[PDB]
Amino acid sequence: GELLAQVEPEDLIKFGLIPEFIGRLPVVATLNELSEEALIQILKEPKNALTKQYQALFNLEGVDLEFRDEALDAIAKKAMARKTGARGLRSIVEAALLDTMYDLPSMEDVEKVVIDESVIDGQSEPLLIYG
Amino acid sequence: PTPHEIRNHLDDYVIGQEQAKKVLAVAVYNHYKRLRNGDTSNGVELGKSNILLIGPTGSGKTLLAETLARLLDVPFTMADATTLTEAGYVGEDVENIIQKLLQKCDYDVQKAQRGIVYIDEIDKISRKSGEGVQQALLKLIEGTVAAVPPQGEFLQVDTSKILFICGGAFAGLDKVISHRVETGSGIGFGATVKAKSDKASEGELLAQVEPEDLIKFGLIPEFIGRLPVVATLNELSEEALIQILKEPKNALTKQYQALFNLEGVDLEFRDEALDAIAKKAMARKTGARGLRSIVEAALLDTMYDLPSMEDVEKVVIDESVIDGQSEPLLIYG
Amino acid sequence: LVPMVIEQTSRGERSFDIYSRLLKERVIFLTGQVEDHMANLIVAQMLFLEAENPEKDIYLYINSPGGVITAGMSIYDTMQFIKPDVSTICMGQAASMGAFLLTAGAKGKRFCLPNSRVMIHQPLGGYQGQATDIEIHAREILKVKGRMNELMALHTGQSLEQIERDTERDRFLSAPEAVEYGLVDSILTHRN
Amino acid sequence: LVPMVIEQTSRGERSFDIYSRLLKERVIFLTGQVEDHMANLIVAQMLFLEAENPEKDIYLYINSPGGVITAGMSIYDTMQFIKPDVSTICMGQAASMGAFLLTAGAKGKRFCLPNSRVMIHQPLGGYQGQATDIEIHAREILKVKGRMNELMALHTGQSLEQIERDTERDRFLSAPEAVEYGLVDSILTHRN
Amino acid sequence: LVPMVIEQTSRGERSFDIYSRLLKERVIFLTGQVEDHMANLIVAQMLFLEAENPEKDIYLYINSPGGVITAGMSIYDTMQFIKPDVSTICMGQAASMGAFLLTAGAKGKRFCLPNSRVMIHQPLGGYQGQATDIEIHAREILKVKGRMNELMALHTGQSLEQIERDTERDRFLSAPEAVEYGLVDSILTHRN
Ligand SMILES: Nc1ncnc2c1ncn2[C@@H]1O[C@H](COP(=O)(O)OP(=O)(O)OP(O)(O)=S)[C@@H](O)[C@H]1O
Ligand SMILES: [Mg+2]
Q: Is D121 a known active-site residue?
């Protein structure tokens, strides 16, 4: 993030851009990789957040799940390690819930699913209450 | 226009480099006055006079060729030698850039003959491949019908009537020049050690440059011969950068102030603030290039909040504002 | 055997030795008894560094029991002549001429290791021959003793009389005591 | 003669000696009697490794009967100053200054060969001259003895009184006994 | 060991040593007792510098107690023969032949360090054998003494009688006294 904040025209020319093109763009809006605090916000606040996408997916069979607060931050840090931006959040949740979607429809008498930091970390399996 | 008229107009957009302006103005006037005489009544042929620019990085060498070209309606293009431009595996031939100059002139080869194609970073291809680029560039600098066939039927224009200006920020050239004319050792008690932060005499030494110095730098004798006209540029001192903030017609201060005048708010930069920006700019080593970035960032905070704030008549920026101690004072009214 | 290190640069791989690699970073070494040959070598290194950059500090590690006084005076003059400030760090020990050079560094840039030791003593000499010749040599050594004492008091900040009394015989001072005496400024224990 | 090994890299073949090749992997050798010249060389190697990577461990094989105490102190300070942890492995023997440096390594990283031997003894010195001078030198050596004992107890974890009694005379301890005493942590018998 | 410095040039990186790098800038060193081997080396350096540029000054640092008189005379003649002016700077000490060469530099270009010392004395010799042979050698040394005194008076500007009286025995003069005597012109304390 800091490296991109300081750029010079010679860098763009060396990359391949013709020198005239750089001059035509006096304004250079440089972005920064989303931080851990920003990842959690984008994980819940957005209307189309992947967290709610999976919740609606399970509603087809009549099951719902909730993500604990202690688990949201854990998913954000793992995504930062992947260095894939917001795209990494979807992959992390998919792998954690991969086993849940593999056997949940087969099982019967399922009411709700609870996932915490330990479940996503692989320490234990996701919790499920029958009803 | 006569050379005197050219000098009067160019000094308004660019300040300093008095010696470089005299030689550059005469070179362009002599080349163009010859082209205008297309009839060539006298049997003597008119040969091109290539120009050479030598100066420290950020001295405005590129701005001198572009600004001077704007004075005329002829097209101007630029190229970079750091990529080893050539028609082959060495790199990308600048011939494509030549066609770009033709495009600017409504794709008319007749007008393309008045090109001012400029090659920058020429000193980066000095012989230590490096020498290969110079050899392939010898013919291009002079008359040569061979070139990339245009696609507007395939033509073959000659590169004899198009002016060629090669300029690069030679590194270490001041050392060889000193060892030739200037006396004294560089190491020892009696050696004349040049202060890095004081005694900026590099510009004066460059003036005493001869073809022999370029030979030792790495340039092959053929390349030097192609460039008969030689010019030098002196480094811009801390005070020089201050003048560039107000004296130039399209200066940074005048541009930002005019922008704020649109909303009825006028900003004034005091002499104390101008010197503060210049001193920090020198440390960054960015030269005049970084002046626009640092000045814009300093006033970026208030510029964003200026349109939203109401009851504003005219703002002002103090020296402490540049250092970040305070914010631009606003006079309510 | 001197290990050969390699420095990675844009131009390409470069061959250097352990001492040469540190020299490129404005670092000098003073090991072994002080003499004319070794002293001249150190002076040459200081001049080369000054030409490359007359502003960057030049470090010099002093680790030796001492040597010829005359050979040591040349190094002192070079340090006080070159514009760059010479930072002296005592490693292992610094006695006789070594101690004098340790306090000759730029004020506020003198350091020493926690276990380093510094010893100061009066000049040592001696001549044999006729009575007249012995008198001349005796006066010469006495003059050198006075000049050395004055220079020591200038850096450490102590009084001239105090330096003379402490130089009558060998005096061993540990690193903590060196700071109080004025030979050094601080002690470099761990990197922070 | 020093064999010349070649390292295969993407750039191309590179020429190096046996000692230089291991130095590139953060490995240092301490062979021969400790002195000012050899001690200074070791210090230079440690500084170079720290600059390249201030986190990777720096190994140092100690194999020597000892030498000048002052020269050894410089190496000890460098090990405790550079951020990288210095791992000391005893090969063959480590006596006098060698034993002190063996226990000066980072806690939990000290090793020794199964047949290695470590000997510890009090400082050795001696001065000749006038009565006043002899008294000054006697006090200096005594102070060095106390400081060395305190440092030894800090690493091995033993009491100060225990170290003093064991240092009154030469004491030979095998590799298994070194672990219990606290000089080393474990013994490297076979690679696992 | 001699550190190897690298000079950055347009052609490319170049390998040089500490002494070679300074030699490229018209700098010569005179360290160690004067003899035939070392004296010949200095003469060769002066000739090479003259060919490269017969106008630029050639520096020469004199730091030695002296040596063979015959060997020193060769250096003096070379300095007065080559068109470039030879600038002599005294570092550390300059006694016997060293002092003579210090005052042999071009007028107005002689310098010395603030702590430098210069000593002047009459020629030293001696022969053993038959009475006739001893007489011949005695006359030879006497003639050399007279010639040396005349040359000294030519540079320092003092009278011939004054030089003879001062050369009867060793005379130690500090840097400030050297300027007044005429051996040197000024003193280089700090760079300005
Ligand atoms: N004399 C000057 N007057 C006004 N602005 C100047 C002057 N010199 C430089 N500048 C400004 O500084 C910028 C950079 O200077 P230039 O020398 O044109 O850069 P450059 O020549 O492209 O550097 P190189 O050779 O490619 S590394 C210019 O685009 C101008 O905005
Ligand atoms: Mg440019």
A: yes
Q: Is there contact between D and B if contact means ≥3 C-beta pairs under 8 Å?
A: no
* Among the listed residues B237, B236, B240, B267, the one whose alpha carbon sits nearest the alpha carbon of residue B254: B267
Strands (E), E65-189: 86-95, 111-112, 117-120, 171-174, 186-187
**Which of D131, D19, D36, D125 shows the shortest CA–CA distance to D74?**
D36
Going along chain E from its start, the domains and CATH numbers come out as 4-187 (3.90.226.10)
Contact B83, B121 (CB under 8 A): no
Residue D83: phi and psi, rounded to 5, are -55, -45
B156's CB contacts (< 8 A; 6+ apart) are: B145, B146, B147, B149
Residue D27, phi then psi, degrees to nearest 5: -135, 135
Terminal CA-to-CA distance of chain A, rounded, Å? 49
Of the partner residues B171, B176, B185, the one whose CB lies closest to the CB of residue E25 = B185
Taking an 8 Å cut-off on Cβ atoms, the answer to whether E18 and C74 are in contact is no
Q: CB distance E172–C140 less than 8 Å?
A: yes
| Closest ligand (CA of B243) | 1
Beta carbons within 8 Å of B293's beta carbon, 6+ residues apart = B286
Technique behind this structure? Answer: cryo-EM
How many angstroms is the resolution? 2.7
Q: Which of E182, E124, E121 is nearest to E154 (CA)?
A: E182
What span, in angstroms and rounded, lies between the C-alpha atoms of A112 and B84?
A: 66
Cα separation of E90 and E110, whole Å? 9
Q: Which chains would you list as touching D if contact means 3+ CB atom pairs under 8 Å?
A: C
**B313-316: long-range contacts, CB 8 A cutoff, minimum separation 24:** B313/B264, B313/B265, B314/B265, B314/B266, B314/B267, B314/B268, B315/B260, B315/B265, B315/B266, B315/B267, B316/B267, B316/B268, B316/B270
Query: Do chains D and A touch by CB distance (3+ pairs < 8 Å)?
Result: no
Residues with CB under 6 A from ligand 1: B 14-16, 57-63, 120-121, 169, 244, 248, 287-289
Residue extents of the structural domains in chain B: 1-234, 235-333
The dihedral built from the CA positions of residue C150, C156, C161 and C164, taken in this order, carries a sign that is negative
First to last CA, chain D: 33
Shortest CA gap C156–chain D (Å): 22
Touching partners of A (3+ C-beta pairs < 8 Å): B
| Chain B: residue whose CA lies nearest to E57 | B184
Give the span between the Cα atoms of D54 and C26, in whole angstroms. Answer: 20
Beta strand residue intervals within B128-191, DSSP E: 165-168
Active site residue E87: no
- Where does residue C56 rank: exposed (0-12), middle (13-18), buried (19+ CB within 10 A)? middle
Are E10 and B183 a contacting pair at CB < 8 A? Answer: no
B60 is in an annotated binding site: yes
Pairwise CA distance, residues C42 & C49, whole Å: 11
Whole-number Å distance, alpha carbon B196 to ligand 2 midpoint, is: 23
Nearest to E23 by CA among E74, E59, E75: E59
DSSP B44-75: SPPPP--EEEE--TTSSHHHHHHHHHHHSSS-
